[PDB]
Amino acid sequence: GAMAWGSSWLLLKNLTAQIDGPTLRTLCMQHGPLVSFHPYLNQGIALCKYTTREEANKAQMALNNCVLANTTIFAESPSENEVQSIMQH
């Protein structure tokens, strides 16, 4: 008799292998509160968790389809099953 809860998850993608993203991680925290974040430069992906569902959706709308000088940032919402796949290598 176990109960399942829905949690806010955001995945940001299309990061170059040449990313050092401490500034990238800090920017995500400013947009929404950050419980935990793991950014990968090499794969060009970063996965982060938000405190509430509404803050997560707002973060995706701003990060998705977002253009910065000479680089493009995309945002997607992986399934909770897809989030587990990322945690497992």
What angle, rounded to 10 degrees, do the helices at 22-31 and 53-63 form? 130
Cα 39 off chain centre by: 8
User: Which residue is listed with tokens 């995500």?
Assistant: 28
SS3 content of the chain, % helix, strand, coil (to 5): 35, 30, 35
- Method used for this model? NMR
Burial label, 60 (beta-carbon count in 10 A; 0-12, 13-18, 19+):
buried
* Contacts of 5 by beta carbon, 8 Å cutoff, 6+ apart: none
Residue from 59, 89, 56 nearest 73 by CA? 59
Q: In terms of DSSP H, where are the helices of 1-89? A: 22-31, 53-63, 80-87
Q: Which two tokens stand for residue 41?
A: 């430069």
CA angle 84, 34, 7 (to 5 degrees): 45
What does the alpha-carbon distance between residue 48 and residue 39 come to, in Å, rounded to a whole number? 8
Residue from 69, 75, 72, 71 nearest 31 by CA? 75
The residues pairing with 66 across neighbouring beta strands, listed in sequence order, are 73
| Residues 1-89, CATH architecture | 2-Layer Sandwich (3.30)
Per-residue b or e along 15-25, where b marks 16 or more CB atoms closer than 10 Å to that residue's CB: beeebebeebe
Q: Where are the domains of the chain?
A: 1-89
